Design a protein around this nucleic acid. Structure first.
Length: 132
DNA sequence: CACACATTAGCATATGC
DNA sequence: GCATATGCTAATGTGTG
């Protein structure tokens, strides 16, 4: 309910503190990584300050940023111190929608991609083709 | 675990200060 | 040139067999 407006107020104040402290969003991600271990990319911080992320994600990243703004105020010095593969895989589709792992290993060795990368890309290919 | 589908979060490049 | 906003899709995660 009002959690929406409370998040929005927190985000506006967060933008104000970030601009006042002279930290870029990539620097914010680096600080989050070096103070918690879960380094985040600057796109996530952008979508946060612009309030683009989903509600569950909104709540999930609220506490980390709360802690960073409540902690970093003390001292800053120590804290500071490809398309052809796509086309080939599309060619591999239209004939065998769900290949076996035996074929997956061959595909991975053929195009030089990691087995897990090819497996997840295959799953998401199926996913977006089953959207429609 | 793993995978069926939903969420999530980082990349390449597009804009902007 | 660096720093933000977008489109887009690897990657995980919920939930499960």
């Amino acid at each position: 309910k009002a959690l929406q407006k409370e998040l929005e107020q927190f985000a506006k104040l967060l933008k104000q503190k970030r601009i006042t402290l002279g930290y870029t969003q990539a620097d914010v991600g680096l600080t989050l990584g070096v103070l918690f271990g879960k380094v985040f990319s600057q796109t996530t911080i952008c979508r946060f300050e612009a309030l683009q992320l989903s509600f569950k994600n909104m709540c999930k990243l609220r506490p980390l940023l709360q802690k960073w703004v409540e902690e970093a105020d003390n001292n800053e010095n120590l804290q500071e111190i490809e398309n052809r593969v796509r086309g080939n895989l599309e060619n591999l589709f239209l004939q065998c929608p769900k290949p076996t792992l035996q074929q997956i290993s061959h595909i991975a060795q053929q195009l030089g991609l990691e087995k897990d990368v090819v497996r997840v890309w295959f799953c998401n290919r199926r996913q977006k083709g089953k959207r429609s």
